[PDB]
Amino acid sequence: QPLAKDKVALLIGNMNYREHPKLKAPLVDVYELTNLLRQLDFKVVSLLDLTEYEMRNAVDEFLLLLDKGVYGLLYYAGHGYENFGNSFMVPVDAPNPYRSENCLCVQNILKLMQEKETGLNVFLLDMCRTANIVFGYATCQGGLANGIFMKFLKDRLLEDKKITVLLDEVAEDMGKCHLTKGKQALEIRSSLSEKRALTDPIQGTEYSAESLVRNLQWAKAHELPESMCLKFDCGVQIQLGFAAEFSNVMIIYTSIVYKPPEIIMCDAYVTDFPLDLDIDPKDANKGTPEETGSYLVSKDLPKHCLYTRLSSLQKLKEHLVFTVCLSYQYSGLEDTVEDKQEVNVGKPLIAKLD
Amino acid sequence: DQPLAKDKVALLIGNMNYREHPKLKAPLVDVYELTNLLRQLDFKVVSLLDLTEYEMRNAVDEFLLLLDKGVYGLLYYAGHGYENFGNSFMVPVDAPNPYRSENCLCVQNILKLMQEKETGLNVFLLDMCRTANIVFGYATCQGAEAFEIQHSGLANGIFMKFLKDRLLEDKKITVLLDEVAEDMGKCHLTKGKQALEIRSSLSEKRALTDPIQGTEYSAESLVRNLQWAKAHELPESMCLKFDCGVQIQLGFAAEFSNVMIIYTSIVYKPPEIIMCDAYVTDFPLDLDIDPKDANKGTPEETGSYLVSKDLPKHCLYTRLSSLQKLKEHLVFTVCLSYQYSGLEDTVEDKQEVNVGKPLIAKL
Ligand SMILES: CO[C@@H](C)c1c(Nc2ccc([C@H](N(C)C(=O)C3CCS(=O)(=O)CC3)C(F)(F)F)cc2)cnc2cc(Cl)nn12
Ligand SMILES: CO[C@@H](C)c1c(Nc2ccc([C@H](N(C)C(=O)C3CCS(=O)(=O)CC3)C(F)(F)F)cc2)cnc2cc(Cl)nn12
């Protein structure tokens, strides 16, 4: 029975390009793929909208996890560039027109992967135009629907079959669909000489330094701040919540859980976020998570709160410090009272790394 | 439902006799055996040994013109190869030492031309020594180290030994090749001697065993049949009669599309004649036939080990390789040295023969 020493996955979805058309599918697809891989016991890091420097750092750190026998999976969705026989992943800060030096060369990553003694290394490119390496290269021409590749991949990914056979079925499913024939293509390259599957069990978990390094890094990237009850001088109590949508996207939500009898009406809101997050106050404190651009973790969030989506957590170099304001009017009075409390929740999710 | 092929054509090239590089042995057996397995799957096959740059570019370009809509193509190359700047190359027998890209055939350039075809299935197999529905098998093996114990020259190469055991399966070509890759992985002898990468954009259930689409007489179909029929035309057997009464039969067999075996035998000898030798000579200079290799008592003495079994026995054999170099009619002389009963004098006679342009030279 083939076994994995560990299962690690890096998933990058680029959508909000500074000088190129915006994509919608990577958001839904990276989130879908993250939960499918968690079902197969992968430790996953999922990141949205990365610059060149961020993507190069993420890919280099992912490659350091590929110790002998480890199963790796690198998925990229976004703009892709093809030039002089090479393909390139396009970061969100790419100039117009594309230049090689600003993008990540796919063949350079494949060359770095061939140097590893991984039990399985899957590299999937879902682009808009022995190492045991399986490379899938999906290409399509330029609301919450999946992209073509993920629509077919998600319905086969949990199969207990050799990864090459399973990807071959995905390519055949696409060729049997009229939507794909003149819109989407799939190319698979493989030097897999053994029976290896994403479903293969992880080997009897020892506590070696090598395995502890891999678990530590992943554990940091998943650290959410604990829920907080803020107590104000006037008696008002605000509950503060934190949810992870991606490794670099966190949803914050607030609710006035206790309002004293003597206070007619009160409003709470979050403000003064670190400037490196670039939070537009007009997109914060929404009555629904969907209004923040958060449509995936929405269902699993408490109701009747105010929501703020904190994306770009990878850009935070300091502690996440922000303010909770309170505007309350006393009974039988004509004054609006303001009071604020600073909150330091440390370095959440991917910002926990350094 | 059952996928169909409009037609099935294959071009197999095996380079062994390098001018400035080491000689290989496995392409001879591998190209011969793969030809016979493909014929069993109803492919029209062209098999060529030892091609120069010019010959290879012509063979590949002419095979690419056969790839009409719905056609199943297979290109197989065995010989020296090299990878330079992400591109791989097929080395022709006239390539200088060291390799120069302009003298070699770029594999990526060929794959690009295949992409422009509406083929039902396009299979490109490289067995090198170091929409289109394309399936590309890139096999690379370690060049034989100087002190390694060599085995028989009639042994299969590593890739073909594994491929021949799966090739006839009625299974999707990508799955079949994936099983070949896995068979090589289980064999620990191949761990550092043979590698195999499979690249595929096949989007349908295509197999080499798919039946050919209800055989027609269209112009486009007849064009592929005609070119292939020309490359398989052998001269018919001849009976040469000499003044002395002796009759000599001259026979012809094909080993490869560019290798023909000629054989002579005495079919009638008058009782008054005792000694009687027939031998072939005056071959076109372009073929470069060494007379020391001609007129042998066994096919194996000419370097012919594959069609030997199907050749008539008790003949004199001559192997004519490099038929692709023949630029005019294959004209040669059949000599007769004989002796009458009771006489010490050896009498001589000869007859010139024109057998047209055989096999690949018929193009
Ligand atoms: C080994 O670590 C774990 C968590 C890890 C990865 N590491 C990783 C991911 C993203 C980044 C980038 N970061 C923070 C910067 O580039 C920073 C560098 C320091 S800085 O001050 O410039 C802030 C930006 C990005 F993409 F988020 F931006 C860097 C490292 C990658 N894949 C996996 C898969 C699994 Cl499982 N674990 N894993
Ligand atoms: C469409 O035709 C058929 C027979 C055909 C091919 N054609 C083909 C064409 C040229 C050559 C070369 N030739 C003669 C020259 O290069 C000559 C060029 C003119 S010349 O006078 O210089 C002598 C050499 C070589 F390789 F033999 F050398 C070899 C093969 C190729 N693949 C297939 C597969 C199937 Cl099925 N049919 N098929």
UniProtKB/Swiss-Prot annotation, chain A:
Instruction: Give the annotated active site.
Output: H79, C128
Kindly list the places in or outside the cell where this protein is found, as annotated in its UniProt entry. Cytoplasm, Perinuclear region; Nucleus
Q: What is the effect of changing E291A?
A: Abolishes binding to TRAF6
Where is the motif (Nuclear export signal)?
33-40
Q: In which tissues is it expressed?
A: Highly expressed in peripheral blood mononuclear cells. Detected at lower levels in bone marrow, thymus and lymph node, and at very low levels in colon and lung.
Stretches the record annotates as Caspase-like: 12-200
Any idea what job this protein has?
Answer: Protease that enhances BCL10-induced activation: acts via formation of CBM complexes that channel adaptive and innate immune signaling downstream of CARD domain-containing proteins (CARD9, CARD11 and CARD14) to activate NF-kappa-B and MAP kinase p38 pathways which stimulate expression of genes encoding pro-inflammatory cytokines and chemokines. Mediates BCL10 cleavage: MALT1-dependent BCL10 cleavage plays an important role in T-cell antigen receptor-induced integrin adhesion. Involved in the induction of T helper 17 cells (Th17) differentiation.
* Disease implication from the record: Immunodeficiency 12: A primary immunodeficiency characterized by onset in infancy of recurrent bacterial and candidal infections resulting in bronchiectasis and growth delay. Manifestations include mastoiditis, aphthous ulcers, cheilitis, gingivitis, esophagitis, gastritis, duodenitis, and meningitis. Levels of absolute lymphocytes and serum immunoglobulins are normal, but specific antibody titers are low despite immunization, and T-cells show impaired proliferative responses to mitogens.
Question: Which family, according to the similarity comment?
Answer: Belongs to the peptidase C14B family.
What is known about its subunit structure? Answer: Homooligomer; forms oligomers which bind to TRAF6. Forms a complex with CARD14 and MALT1; resulting in the formation of a CBM (CARD14-BCL10-MALT1) complex. Forms a complex with CARD11 and MALT1; resulting in the formation of a CBM (CARD11-BCL10-MALT1) complex. Forms a complex with CARD9 and MALT1; resulting in the formation of a CBM (CARD9-BCL10-MALT1) complex.
Q: What is this protein called?
A: Mucosa-associated lymphoid tissue lymphoma translocation protein 1
**Species name:** Homo sapiens (Human)
Q: What is the lineage of its organism?
A: Eukaryota, Metazoa, Chordata, Craniata, Vertebrata
* Full-sequence range covered: 337 to 716 of 824
